[PDB]
Swiss-Prot record:
EC top class, as a word: hydrolase
Subunit (UniProt): Monomer.
Protein name (record): Lysozyme C
UniProt keyword Disulfide bond present: yes
Keyword Manganese: no
Name of the coding gene: LYZ
Tissues of expression: In the egg white and polymorphonuclear leukocytes.
Family statement: Belongs to the glycosyl hydrolase 22 family.
Keyword terms: Allergen, Antimicrobial, Bacteriolytic enzyme, Disulfide bond, Glycosidase, Hydrolase, Secreted, Signal
Miscellaneous field: Lysozyme C is capable of both hydrolysis and transglycosylation; it also shows a slight esterase activity. It acts rapidly on both peptide-substituted and unsubstituted peptidoglycan, and slowly on chitin oligosaccharides.
Amino acid sequence: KVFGRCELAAAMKRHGLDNYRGYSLGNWVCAAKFESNFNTQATNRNTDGSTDYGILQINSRWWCNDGRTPGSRNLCNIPCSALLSSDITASVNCAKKIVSDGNGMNAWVAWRNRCKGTDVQAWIRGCRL
């Protein structure tokens, strides 16, 4: 599924991401825009044997089980298949766990490369939330 921008923001807000751990809603929408272009089925395979899954491109080394990644910790306690669902439930629940670790939203490559320090409230422009 390819989400619309405000459609996604609304779902993320329902699940309490607005301001979670110090990250306003626009950070999360921006992250999804540049990680996956809002595509729930996006997949990126990396050189270290891990794969990034879904709308938030969550990595399989620490966060989900795909049965084939070295150093697997599966700290969200979910199959990586859950992160490719058309609803965002598993991705947002796991994201809360990721962002509560160590480096916050710096875990997301695209957020660090395209969102950090920008006018992130632009990503919820014209949404009625």
